[PDB]
Amino acid sequence: IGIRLTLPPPKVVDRWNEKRAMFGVYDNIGILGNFEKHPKELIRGPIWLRGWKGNELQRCIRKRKMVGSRMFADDLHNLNKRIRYLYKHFNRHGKFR
Amino acid sequence: ISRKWEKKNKIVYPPQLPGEPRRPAEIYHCRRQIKYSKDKMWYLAKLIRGMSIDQALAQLEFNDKKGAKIIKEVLLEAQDMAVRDHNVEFRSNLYIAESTSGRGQCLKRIRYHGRGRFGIMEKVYCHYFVKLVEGPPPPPEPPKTAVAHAKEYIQQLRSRTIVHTL
Amino acid sequence: VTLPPHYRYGMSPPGSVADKRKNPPWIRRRPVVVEPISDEDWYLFCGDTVEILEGKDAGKQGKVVQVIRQRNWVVVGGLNTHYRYIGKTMDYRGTMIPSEAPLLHRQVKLVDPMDRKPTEIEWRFTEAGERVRVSTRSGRIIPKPEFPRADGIVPETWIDGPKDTSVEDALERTYVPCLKTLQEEVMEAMGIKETRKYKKVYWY
Amino acid sequence: TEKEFMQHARKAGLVIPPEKSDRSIHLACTAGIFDAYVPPEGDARISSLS
Amino acid sequence: VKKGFRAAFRFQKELERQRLLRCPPP
Amino acid sequence: AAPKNRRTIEVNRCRRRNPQKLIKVKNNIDVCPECGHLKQKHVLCAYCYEKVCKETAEIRRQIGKQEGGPFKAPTIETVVLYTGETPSEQDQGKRIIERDRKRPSWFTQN
RNA sequence: GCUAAACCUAGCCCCAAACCCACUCCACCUUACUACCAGACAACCUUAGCCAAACCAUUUACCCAAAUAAAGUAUAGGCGAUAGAAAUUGAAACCUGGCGCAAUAGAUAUAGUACCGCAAGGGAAAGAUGAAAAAUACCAAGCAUAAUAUAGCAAGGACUAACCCCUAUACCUUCUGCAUAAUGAAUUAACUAGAAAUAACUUUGCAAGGAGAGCCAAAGCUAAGACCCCCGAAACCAGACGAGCUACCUAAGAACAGCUAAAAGAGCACACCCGUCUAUGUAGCAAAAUAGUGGGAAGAUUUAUAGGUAGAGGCGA
RNA sequence: ACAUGAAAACAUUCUCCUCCGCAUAAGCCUGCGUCAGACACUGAACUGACAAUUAACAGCCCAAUAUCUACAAUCAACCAACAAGUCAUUAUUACCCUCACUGUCAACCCAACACAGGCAUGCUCAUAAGGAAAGGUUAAAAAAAGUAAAAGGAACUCGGCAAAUCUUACCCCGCCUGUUUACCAAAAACAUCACCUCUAGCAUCACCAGUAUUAGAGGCACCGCCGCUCCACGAGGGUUCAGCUGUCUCUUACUUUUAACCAGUGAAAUUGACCUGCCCGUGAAGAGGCGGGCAUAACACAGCAAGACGAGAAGACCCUAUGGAGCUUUAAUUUAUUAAUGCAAACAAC
Ligand SMILES: [Mg+2]
Ligand SMILES: [Mg+2]
Ligand SMILES: [Mg+2]
Ligand SMILES: [Mg+2]
Ligand SMILES: [Mg+2]
Ligand SMILES: [Mg+2]
Ligand SMILES: [Mg+2]
Ligand SMILES: [Mg+2]
Ligand SMILES: [Mg+2]
Ligand SMILES: [Mg+2]
Ligand SMILES: [Mg+2]
Ligand SMILES: [Mg+2]
Ligand SMILES: [Mg+2]
Ligand SMILES: [Mg+2]
Ligand SMILES: [Mg+2]
Ligand SMILES: [Zn+2]
């Protein structure tokens, strides 16, 4: 019980597909391009997560302040509740003071 | 589920040279999903265990338990295909080798109790397994006689060595 | 037409006794991945001789009797057939007759009628614009084989019944276009006279 | 509690495939000899008279 | 179903050892 | 009162498989001299008792059909007669029951 | 060897991009899904409280429409917990995405269905063959195979030898101290609980300079590594749903044998209403009952139907 | 823990019971009609298919505008009332088409169930209708119900509780009557006629379509006397006479149910693991498990309740929480709210 009685199907990985064979290209565009472009501008992803990093609390304010007006009603309510809980936990709880 | 008992009748041994003796015939038969308790059916299986087929039928015919008639039919059809399909010459030259009961699939029902309480009752089902071997039943093991006790005690006394030394 | 979203198609037609038993309404099996083939791209039709490529008996040619577009299945009569017992009862052993097995459209290849060799085929238009299929090598015209129609009617041997309209009566035209409805034309035909007028009502 | 078995099995043999179907079972051989041949009596002695 | 391969691989060797012990070859 | 600890399977085996809990072997089983079916020494044979009841039921069915109504019990003796039989010299003034069957071998005629 | 055990899809999550659906016929605001009669009926009005300041009366962050910076600065505040700007500065863009989940996971979802609730509302479980069904071996726990022979946390040292010999006061948690007769645990499988970089430490880079505007610097500056759990109250407030049980009321109904008496909130006594005492029952027939015995039984009596009073409230012999 | 009265040709007959039965309304919605696939083959209150309940009963009504309607009911005649009641038209205009639609079954509704409960009305007042307490056996303990009992008759007991019998008187409290803690209190508690106190001079949804002999808010609890007695009554709390009885001295016998065995179906609390003995001592201070002694083949069934600080709801009982809630107030902070006055505003009011 709790373990499979047969071997899982073997997995095949293409180490030389288009994405793997050219990962990291243009990451030094700023150094080698007279600083006309920043490697941060190559970041592809969420609007509030482009060239920025922070803890869970900080990510919630940044999402709310930038795209909060466009979120769904249920999602906005949950995001507001998450900020309230995170604010209480970080500013009032912990081993260290 | 598992149904290995049925497949036990499909194994075929290679032909035997005249030098080796006759391999006794064996038949595996079982009835599934019997509306009976496996604990209650165990007593009947143990009762007819090791006895002849026809003696077992006589004992089961006059038994008042409901499971007795179920085993009686199972033994009867087991004897039929033994002669018909398993190259058994004499239908009365059979003895019970192993008879046992196993738990079957059971349902769960609600039994109402007072004060709004309830209890989960269970509709018990069980299987019955039986193996028949051609030939007279083996003689029962005789009681161990006093002389047998005497030699065994002597052997223990003669098998002791000086311990914790060379 | 009552099929589950992940219904699996089999040899038995949907709704048949065997299909209902094999595929109960509550069954949920893993869907079978089938390469999509467009209606125009498909070139396998009933009654066409097809040369099978991969099988226990390769190199043989046969005519497809049934085609399943949902699973890209081609069934060739007398080819790729296993064996089974028919009419099995508790007292009878059963009748042994061969039974075909499904074959994929890639497991088989169309054959040139003039040259008994598989060829690759493409769809090309004729001079009149009617669509045909032309083979890659030694291109020619291979039309759709004539097959018995599903309803089982044979117009070449059709006889009108007591309740069957004659061709001349069915094809002759009596409609004279005009600005009258069915009701008023019928009413004047039968001479029905209605002097009373319809008073205006309120609609909302 | 209401859970029960799936005992919806109906006895089914292999007699007739569904009708009004273009596909039909292909037969490779006939059921029996078209004309019965009665062996002449004494063919065992005819075997000796090769 | 738990993703992973080493645990299943180790289990297969253990079963084969049991199968070997169940009926050792001549 | 509730159990204090769970009883182990070793203890349960010692109780459930006790010799007096087992079914005792019956040694009063013998074959019927007439039909060859098993019977007990002190119990009537099932085969022969049941075949007598069916004949008794058939005769009783003939009894009611000839009777034709409740509360009409005859005040005379009754004798059942089979096919190809005639009333006896001592069989006079007694109700006669006709059975469309041959008299059984075990049914000895007086 | 039996109840079983295993499986890979169904589908889902987070982003990018892009602004979405709603008349076959018929019915559907009256008791919705009901072919067909004189009306007048109207929407708009600061949220509160939990919680934190270890109480609390005061106060206590909640997208408001450009990221970064100015800056947690100026200011506000039982000047205390905490709250918190602006002037000014100025931003990039190449979906064809996943070091996301794989049936106790991922949406609750096979479905807001089954089922529970008068209503508002709550809310599941599960599937697994194969190319073809027109082919029908080994694994938890529990048992069985195979009940048991002095003696004892069940084991260890051993031994020719299972036991017999000798030794040994179960685990976790809470307390100074538990074999403790203090809590927790029948057993198995799965699920289930340490989140943050102010300073300091370690290791690169550069160096009186460091940093890809802003910031720091009297060897500093930049970068990286590395520290801060889970479940559980009685409560408070806001908005809905409830008087088919019950408290009371309104509309119009119905029931009360016989005897004594007298025009009786009279007496005996059925139907009927109630429930004084005893016994039975105590997972029961019953989440308040049965048997007997009792009070009332023409009245402030009993009872069927429809309607009204709703929680900061109603109703109350 | 649960069940199916008996014989039999399964035609029928027999024994026993009814406090039930039929219909309507309300409710429910095909839920023991046919065919096929505890008990069960015809097995069936399960599944699939087929079949059905036909309107005269009932439901579903009414042209308009004006105008009428003092005198109960109770055999309604006497009589006697108060609580003052449950049933009526006419004038004129308009008006002549007609039998449409729906309810109609059942062993049935609310109680988680085929639940000993709850459930309105009309007939039957013992049935002309509807049903079966015993699956079989034995006749141990123990438990429940019933019957019988020598002699005595409350000596039993907190108490004449129960049972038998069908008695008398007294005290306390409450006038009586009625009402309440649905589910531990039916009372001395509450309401109650009667009496007393306070407030109100009046229209168009309550009071009220009323007006100081009225209305509202209260206290007390009739009558009577000058705070106290008196009738009647009470499932209220005490006492007593006589009788009565197994309450007792002192229990015994019999019947039924549980009971035990046989066959079928088959729960719940509980459970760290157990190979689970006694005495004394020791110990977190009350030991089957530690120490010293003793006892000791294995094993099931029926009883017993001394122990396993037995089991069942983090029980009740005391303390803590800078934990709650209900109530009170001359606890602290308020008048936002309402009402009444003053000023301003507006021209006596709003
Ligand atoms: Mg109930
Ligand atoms: Mg009367
Ligand atoms: Mg009275
Ligand atoms: Mg009392
Ligand atoms: Mg019992
Ligand atoms: Mg009995
Ligand atoms: Mg006496
Ligand atoms: Mg006394
Ligand atoms: Mg009494
Ligand atoms: Mg009273
Ligand atoms: Mg009470
Ligand atoms: Mg009072
Ligand atoms: Mg039994
Ligand atoms: Mg507090
Ligand atoms: Mg508080
Ligand atoms: Zn016989």
Q: In Å, what is the CA distance from A84 to each residue of A61, A73, A78, A80, A90?
A: 11, 17, 10, 6, 10
Residue numbers of the domain that contains A51: 1-96
Question: What residues are paired with B108 via a beta bridge?
Answer: B122
The beta strands (E) that lie in chain C are given as 49-52, 61-68, 73-76, 81-86, 95-100, 103-104, 108-110, 121-125, 131-135
Query: Does strand H come within 7 Å of the CB of B78?
Result: no
Question: What residues are paired with C68 via a beta bridge?
Answer: C73
Query: Could you tell me which of F23, F29, F45, F30 has the C-alpha nearest to residue B65?
Result: F23
Q: What is the DSSP string of B134-153?
A: ESPPPPPPPPPPHHHHHHHH
Query: Given the structure tokens 């005497």, which residue do they identify?
Result: B150
Could you tell me the distance in Å between the CA of residue B55 and the C1' of nucleotide H122?
Answer: 73
What experiment produced this structure? cryo-EM
Could you tell me the distance in Å between the CA of residue C46 and the C1' of nucleotide H29?
Answer: 54
Q: What pairing do the DSSP bridges indicate for beta strands C103-104 and F78-81? A: unpaired
State whether residue B59 is helix, strand or coil. helix
Q: Give dist(CA B47, CA B41) in Å, integer.
A: 10
Instruction: Looking at the complex, report in whole angstroms how far the Cα of residue C98 sits from the nearest Cα belonging to chain D.
Output: 7
CB proximity list for A19: less than 8 A, separation 6 or greater: none
In degrees, to the nearest 5, what angle opens at C-alpha F89 toward C-alphas F83 and F94? 70
Q: Give dist(CA B78, CA B71) in Å, integer.
A: 10
Query: Given the structure tokens 């509360």, which residue do they identify?
Result: F71
Q: Which residue of A has its CA nearest to E1?
A: A4
Expressed in angstroms and rounded, the spacing between residue E8 Cα and the centre of ligand 12 is 87
Which bases along strand H come within 7 Å of a protein CB atom?
A: 8-13, 112-113, 262-276, 298-301, 305, 308, 310-311
**Nucleotide with smallest C1' distance to residue A84 CA:** G62
Instruction: Looking at the complex, report in whole angstroms how far the Cα of residue F19 sits from the nearest Cα belonging to chain B.
Output: 11
Query: Does strand H come within 7 Å of the CB of F12?
Result: no
Q: Do chains F and C touch (3 or more CB pairs under 8 A)?
A: no
Touching E (3+ Cβ pairs <8 A), the chains are: A
Q: What is the DSSP string of chain D?
A: -------------SS---SS-S--PPP-S-SS-SS---PPTTHHHHHH--
Write down which residues 48-87 in F have CB closer than 7 A to strand H: 53, 56-57, 60-61, 63-65, 67, 70
Task: Identify the CATH homologous superfamily for domain B1-166.
Answer: Ribosomal protein L22/L17 (3.90.470.10)
Q: Give dist(CA B109, CA D42) in Å, integer.
A: 76
Buried residues in B139-166 as b, exposed as e (16+ CB within 10 A): eeeeeeeeeeeeeeeeeeeeeeeeeeee
How many other C-beta atoms lie within 10 A of the C-beta of residue B94? 27
Q: In Å, what is the CA distance from D36 to each residue of B6, B7, B88, D32, D39?
A: 43, 43, 39, 9, 10
Sign of the C-alpha dihedral computed for residues B38, B44, B48 and B53 taken in this order: negative
Give the pair of three-digit tokens for residue F76: 């005379």
CB contact under 8 A, B109 and D1: yes
Write down which residues 16-35 in F have CB closer than 7 A to strand H: 18, 20-21
**Is the separation of the CB atoms in C7 and C32 below 8 Å?**
no
Q: What is the DSSP string of chain F?
A: ---SSPPPHHHHHHHHT-TTTSPPPP--EEE-TTT--EEESSS--HHHHHHHHHHHHHHHHHHHHHH-SSS---SS-EEEE-TT----SS--SSEEEE-SSPPPSSS---
**Is the separation of the CB atoms in B126 and B34 below 8 Å?**
yes
CB contact under 8 A, A4 and E9: no
Give the pair of three-digit tokens for residue B8: 């036990």
Query: Does strand H come within 7 Å of the CB of B121?
Result: yes
Which of 32-71 (F) contact B at CB < 8 A? Answer: 38, 40
Q: In Å, what is the CA distance from E9 to each residue of C166, E2, E22?
A: 77, 13, 20
Expressed in angstroms and rounded, the spacing between residue A89 Cα and the centre of ligand 15 is 20
The domain locations on chain C are 3-146
User: Which are the residues after which chain D is interrupted (C to N > 2.5 Å)?
Assistant: none
CB proximity list for C58: less than 8 A, separation 6 or greater: C52
CB contact under 8 A, E1 and A4: yes
Instruction: Looking at the complex, report in whole angstroms how far the Cα of residue F22 sits from the nearest Cα belonging to chain B.
Output: 6
Annotated binding site of F: 32, 35, 45, 48
Number of domains in chain A: 1
